[PDB]
């Protein structure tokens with residue numbers, strides 16, 4: 001973690017680099033031979049949007065997704081972690097990582113509607129007025145198809161559309 | 163507000179009805195029975 | 206060096222860059238230099254002098270700039286990213302004046 005410090009003194013602006021301590025990776029990965037950070041920790045096809053401890057390890061202090069060249073995730077796993085992180089945000093988890101604006105905690109709104117496993121953004125969705133009958137139906141998406149490869153203990157495949 | 167022109171199952175436009183996982187199960191079960199059949203029908 | 210030259214660098218008095226080439230961390234400052242040494246940037250202001258000071262013994266990369274509102278900008282290269290220096294440079298030396 002590299003913090004950049006800045007000062008205004010005597011009409012001079014001073015900018016300086018500062019290096020704090022990064023945690024080293026945990027001692028003993030289950031699949032040392034493994035390539036990508038998800039895989040050697042044997043977490044592939046396992047984590048869901050619900051697992052916060054795993055997701056938070058890739059993101060920024062102000063809440064955005066971390067870049068891939070730094071993390072080095074197998075591309076498949078990178079897109080999955082994106083969708084997972086967005087679902088996690090919209091699900092009102094990671095309340096720490098929202099950016100901090102003082103004027104922002106003033107404006108009372110009707111308390112956030114609790115939602116979870118939300119695929120799209122709240123704005124872009126248009127209310128479906130027409131439904132349609134048994135044979136042609138408009139389906140409401142739930143979760144993202146990127147997660148369709150997760151393990152099913154029930155043996156039953158997940159319902160992506162309802 | 164959605165219609166199926168003419169009669170439901172007859173004409174050149176029909177009701178779309180989809181195949182289901184149940185139906186696949188049944189079809190495959192019956193196939194397996196036939197395969198075993200012709201093995202015993204062979205000799 | 207586009208972001209700098211698009212901003213009309215004419216407001217600068219003096220740009221001096223002191224660096225120590227044999228230190229393993231040099232690149233950023235050097236990169237900064239080559240974006241200052243660009244033709245368009247230097248073509249905007251003929252009143253701006255760019256001096257490159259090189260020291261072997263010094264061990265500290267540093268960039269100092271002066272501009273016409275009476276501002277003295279000192280940026281200390283150690284761990285600072287190349288594009289960060291040019292970024293802070295643009296918001297400091299252009300938006301101010």
Ligand SMILES: [Zn+2]
Pocket residue numbers: 035036037038039073074077
């Ligand atoms: Zn992988």
